[PDB]
Amino acid sequence: PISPIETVPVKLKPGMDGPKVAQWPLTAAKIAALVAICTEMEKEGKISKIGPENPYNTPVFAIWAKLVDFRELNKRTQDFWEVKSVTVLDVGDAYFSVPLDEDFRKYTAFTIPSINNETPGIRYQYNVLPQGWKGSPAIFQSSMTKILAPFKAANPDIVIYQYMDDLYVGSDLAIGAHRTKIEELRQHLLRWGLTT
User: What is the rounded distance in angstroms from the CA atom of residue 90 to the CA atom of residue 164?
Assistant: First the structure.
């Protein structure tokens, strides 16, 4: 889903405009692939079609996994403040549940190419943290930290540590009472839109 957390305000570096990078033609398999991916993403509110008033563009590609090449956007984006039983929870896909600042969404515009240069191509922008964008790790870690604050309070007998994309949970609880804690954690995250 999309987490009910407030967005972090983000800006381009001073005197900078958004990227306008031309999209590489894609393999017909790749385009059909992206179209299915984006369709669900749109259905889920993760991305939105955009109008002629958005002039920006960043190249995407498929690998099916959609990949965005935010090289150019990353250069124009402000800097961020970069910061026994053990379970490692993969929260990599939970980026797509954290809202992206509304005023910044327009800079993430991308185009899925049209088959055979026929149609114009569908334009979308992100409503959530895109992967590979400069500020996602820092905004995600920060949001994750606020979401976990109440859980850590109630369970100070557990060490929750995040290396980006992974949540490391450790405790000296027996394998059963620890596994139960992992499950209470997963349900708490779920309350907040994050699925793990």
Answer: 9
At 29 the three-state DSSP class reads: helix
Looking at 79-135, list the stretches that DSSP marks H as alpha helix, in order from N- to C-terminal side: none
> How many Å apart are CA 67 and CA 59, to the nearest integer?
9
Specify the CATH number of the domain 84-95+140-196. Answer: 3.30.70.270
Residue-range domain boundaries for the chain: 1-83+96-139, 84-95+140-196
- Does 2.40.50.100 match the CATH number of domain 1-83+96-139? no
What is the residue type of 26?
L
Which 3 state secondary structure label does DSSP give 173? coil
Q: For residue 193, count CB atoms less than 10 angstroms from its CB and return exposed for 0-12, middle for 13-18, buried for 19 or more.
A: middle
Q: Are 99 and 63 in contact (CB under 8 A)?
A: no
